[PDB]
Amino acid sequence: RFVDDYLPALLAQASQLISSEFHEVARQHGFSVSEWRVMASLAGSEPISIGQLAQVTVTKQPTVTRLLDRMEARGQVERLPITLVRITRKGLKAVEHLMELAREHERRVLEPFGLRRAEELKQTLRQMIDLHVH
Template sequence: MGAQAETTAAQASFVDDYLAALLARASHLISAEFHRIVQAGGFSVGEWRILATLTDSPGRSVGEIARVALNKQPTVTRMLDRMEARGYVERFAHASDRRVTLVRITAAGQDVVAGLLTLAKAHEARVLEPLGAGHAAELKTMLRRIIELNEAAD
């Protein structure tokens, strides 16, 4: 960190220099605009997160979906019930452990979320563009590392 950055950090209030507060504020600011688009498309933010989580997956457990989609498992189960009734997701038994139920997105679910995925990628590109490609990639790498280290601690 350069001298100017150190001085600025030293002068910053607690919440202006506290990682959790910075991440929360950045997430809120970045997400708010896109969440309006999701809701205008007829989905709750939770439903969007579930569909996005399932998009590139052959199937995930309800617990894993809850962890990635940032919701409690009972809430995710209720959303999955509604989404399954609408034909967007389906449940199936794990191949080697029949006690585990997995969830996957259906073709209909993939069709309805495809447009939102395109909009999400465009939104992300607009947000990251001022950072430049190198810094944007570095930021994502660091965030994935923070997540990995903290999930391992759970």
């Protein structure tokens, strides 16, 4: 069957299944998917452009702008003059424990594969992103 070994289908299924597991945890901790992606993407980061944030969070830029309107109103992020965006201390403290849980979940996902295969997967994915980003 074509779909059994078609790379874009494999990537999309693996991504949806693993992400859906963690999204249940995020919601139980009071986060929507989009708020989790924004805060996790900005944590530990220098300010980045709205367009960079949209790419890394895999969210359309007009959707990101609406999201930032409300997250900035809640004091979790700040836009700065191309517009840059950063997480605030309030946002970092809000997301820090969830980030620890995300690392634990990722470790569980990767444990059956071993360190070599896990690092090879992450390296390949990073190289693909850097080759295909606009």
